Symmetry: D2
Subunit: 235 residues, 4 copies
């Protein structure tokens, strides 16, 4: 199966797989059962921003999520990603719905990785502030589409703009990303994305994640709903 | 056949296909017969740097090449690249040898493209200061290799470091690049590369080019030597 | 007197100093009498974006201005800025009102300059997306203030948000900028700013400019109104 | 007195002020007595590179120093810089000599700071790869000079290139830097510098530091030698 490191914006509390009893941000290392969570005061129908940062010296994966006019939520976990992920990865966004539903709309996405050797810099940077119908530098999986209102819709939305249940979709950047190299003295990455989660319901589900995977990662069988398009089971 | 826009560092004067009688830098629009050239005081065995710049407002493709302690050469050509190239391209480096030969060593390569809409920025940036044996974000073609002394060797070099004749090789960045979009008010790109051209001979050949192509571009049949791995003939 | 190169967003047609009979974008080289203009379909009360680009190889100063959902305006002028400006400059935003008035609100401002030598890069980059009451890396002149609603108000606005007539203000980045150096083979810069020009009147005035000056530039005596805080007279 | 946070490359072991018995890298928070050190296998006459990173989420100041063909040294310290430094700072390089001496030559220096609000980015970036005789965007203090061989010489060097004892010099970037803002959800910075420490002696002294200070910081009285141009005493 795939190797997954993700930051989840988990909109629906599944208390039998260890979610707390509230919407939360979480760090997921090879399991949907977050190694660390924080309470997230999710706002239905508001555009929010998530930031993810890591470096190989500190070996600490950190995330912050906010909305305009509101306090942030943050979570951190000590993990050496060179012990979890392979040397070459792909980076992506995932989202799902289940019997409860929401839009999983991405308005922008940026990513920077840097490898500094002892010679000196290798870097990759992309920024999307709008998505075209045919966005050739993204690999879309499952129900993900680009170009509606210039956005990335990770899960299915109707003609009328209503979100659909039982949906899963992902978008990965086309180029592999180099996160370890034998002469690297510092490796770092940052990601940002802006999202709009809207639901007609009092109980939206299931969430959006930023993830890093093996380069050939695909949507696991039956990873709708609580598994966020990332994991085949709740182990 | 492929669509090619390139900047050539042409080490060998082929006067029957319009080269001037000296090493030169040139702008190549769909032909090895440069639309514009300038004299280049090429230095055998010295590391040099080339810079390429363009934007959609000015519609002028410009290049500068230099060595430390020496004067630069520069060439410019007015061309609307949205009339020559498709909306999605790949970017790359090419080099060849013929019956005359040289190393076509790349020590670093960087590229930045920006699309500014009326909404606002879409960007791609990569930087390579060293190349690994298995450089998964490059597409190598022909004789190109990575990882010898951490460099990109575009054409064949022997165990002893001697350049081989009748060689052609290219490297393209893995992700397609978006150089036109319908809401773009400004599109721009810049490229830089550092190169080491060495020959045991008084007459090195054939040269290195930075190029932009259709995304599915491949080395044309019989494009060794004067055709620089870019063109199928000298039309 | 100061040396000024500017891009003007000129909201009020002063036909006796050569303005065309409509709001316009213009390139100003040492004179309020633009060397080049283009028609600008200015939108009272809409946030717009201006982009300015130049490089020393092409020697062409270009600008684009747009609003969301609208066509752009663009202007270009061939000028070697190394023949007009000194080696060290400051960069800034200016605005004025006269007997006719408008807000001259800046919501964001970014600037990048690069000097590439034959050795290789020297760079400066700043980005402001919000302005604090005490913004220590800006030099405010005249009526300019920071921190109201997190914006830069270049000209006077009342408690109620009404723009005031006979006002002039500028903001310059604190650090001098190096735009020529003797070993530079390419020098370039880009600027972006987002602005909100609002007036209760059918005839707003006078405009906003992005400018480059001698480092010790100050507001000329009596440069309210048609002189945009840039020039002492209409020569 | 000034407020100082620094990363020291300490070439001379002063064991009575807590230095270990070897050249070392250290994190200095308001004291020359490092809060944390690591062994540094300093190489007389070799160009080396230092990297410094921090962010407000992790609150961990980390540094790495290396030379080509050698293993790195690294040091980290948990510190909330918003509790140590004011909201506006200057950033700089310092160096000293005493009765033992060395060159304190800077070949390049780069710095990036980012403030991400809940609205979204404020950024400053500079890069120097060469220094001119009159480098107007640096504040030079004490014996520091620019433009000899295009380098920054932090301490005195003779006509012949011999380093002088009893010397102290600093260079600060001209613009103040904003490292805390009330709406910032993430603040980060990175610095890089390349240095050449050369001595005719078996015992070079005293070292180079990257530092962050109050904006009006100056060289303390009698801060030659072991105090690195940073501190007035060894408290
Ligand atoms: Ca859940
Ligand atoms: Ca030729
Ligand atoms: Ca006017
Ligand atoms: Ca010491
Ligand atoms: Mn969860
Ligand atoms: Mn030619
Ligand atoms: Mn005008
Ligand atoms: Mn020490």
């Amino acid at each position: 199966a795939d190797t997954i490191v993700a930051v989840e914006l988990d909109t629906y509390p599944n208390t039998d797989i260890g979610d707390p009893s509230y919407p939360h941000i979480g760090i997921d290392i090879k399991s949907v059962r977050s190694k660390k969570t924080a309470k997230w005061n999710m706002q239905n129908g508001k555009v929010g921003t998530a930031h993810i940062i890591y470096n190989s010296v500190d070996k600490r994966l950190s995330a912050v999520v906010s909305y305009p006019n509101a306090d942030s939520a943050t979570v951190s976990y000590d993990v050496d990603l060179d012990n979890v992920l392979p040397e070459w990865v792909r980076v992506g966004l995932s989202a799902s719905t289940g019997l409860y539903k929401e839009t999983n709309t991405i308005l922008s996405w940026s990513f920077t990785s840097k490898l500094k050797s002892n010679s000196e810099t290798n870097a990759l940077h992309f920024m999307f502030n709008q998505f075209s119908k045919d966005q050739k530098d993204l690999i879309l999986q499952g129900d993900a589409t680009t170009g509606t209102d210039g956005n990335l819709e990770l899960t299915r939305v109707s003609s009328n703009g209503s979100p659909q249940g039982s949906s899963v979709g992902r978008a990965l950047f086309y180029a592999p990303v180099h996160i370890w190299e034998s002469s690297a003295v510092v490796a770092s990455f940052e990601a940002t994305f802006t999202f709009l989660i809207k639901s007609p319901d009092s109980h939206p589900a299931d969430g959006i994640a930023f993830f890093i995977s093996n380069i050939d990662s695909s949507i696991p069988s039956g990873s709708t709903g609580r598994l966020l398009g990332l994991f085949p089971d709740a182990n």
